C-alpha cells in the first residue's frame, strides 16, 4: 500500500466535538479498510464526523462493505455525515440501496449543508 487514499485536514471553524476531513483517493476494499480503521481512532469525544468525498472517484463492492461496517461500528451519539459523493460512488450506493440512519449516517450535497445545524 502506497497510502494514496488518505484523510486530509479541512480548514474550517467548528466546535471541538466536530471532526471535518476530506477523503482523497479511491475507496477500493484494501485502501478503504485502512482508511476507516484509521478514522475509528479519531472519534473520541466527537458528536459529528463530516467526510467530504469530492476526491473519491471510485467505490467498489469491498470498499462499500468496509464503509457499511465502519458505519455499523460508530459509537453511540456519533453521527457520520458524508458530502460531495461523486457519480460512481453515488451510483454504487444507490444500486446497493444505502439509506441514511437517524443519528448515525446522513448524506449532504456539500459542506455547507453538512454543517448547517452547526
Amino acid at each position: 500500500g502506497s497510502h494514496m487514499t488518505r484523510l486530509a485536514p479541512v480548514v474550517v471553524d467548528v466546535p471541538d466535538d466536530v471532526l471535518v476531513l476530506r477523503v482523497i483517493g479511491p475507496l477500493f476494499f484494501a485502501a478503504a479498510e485502512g482508511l476507516f480503521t484509521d478514522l475509528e481512532s479519531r472519534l473520541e469525544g466527537k458528536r459529528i464526523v463530516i467526510l467530504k468525498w469530492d476526491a473519491v472517484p471510485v467505490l467498489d463492492a469491498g470498499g462499500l462493505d468496509a464503509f457499511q461496517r465502519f458505519v455499523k461500528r460508530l459509537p453511540e451519539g456519533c453521527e457520520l455525515r458524508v458530502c460531495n459523493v461523486e457519480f460512481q460512488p453515488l451510483r454504487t450506493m444507490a444500486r446497493a440501496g444505502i439509506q441514511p440512519i437517524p443519528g448515525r449516517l446522513a448524506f449532504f450535497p456539500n459542506r455547507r449543508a453538512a454543517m448547517a445545524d452547526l
Binding site: 457519480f87 451510483r91 444507490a94 450535497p109
Partner: protein, 77 residues
Amino acid sequence: STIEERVKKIIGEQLGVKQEEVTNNASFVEDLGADSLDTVELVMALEEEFDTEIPDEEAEKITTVQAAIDYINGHQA
C-alpha cells in the same frame, strides 16, 4: 412515443416535474430541481429502458435534457 418523447417522459417521472417543463434546454439541477441522486437514478432509468450500460465518464456529462437525448440517440452500440 418517439425516443425523444420517451426520454423526456422518464426525466419528468424521475425528477417529478410536469412534462411541460422538460424542455430540451433544461438542466436537471439548475432548472428542474434535481440533486445528484435524482441524476444518478435518472441515468439508471435510461440504462434500463434503453437496455444499455452507460460508462461513468459519459454518464457524468448527462446533466441536461438535450444531453440525455443526444447520448441515447448517439450511443446505440
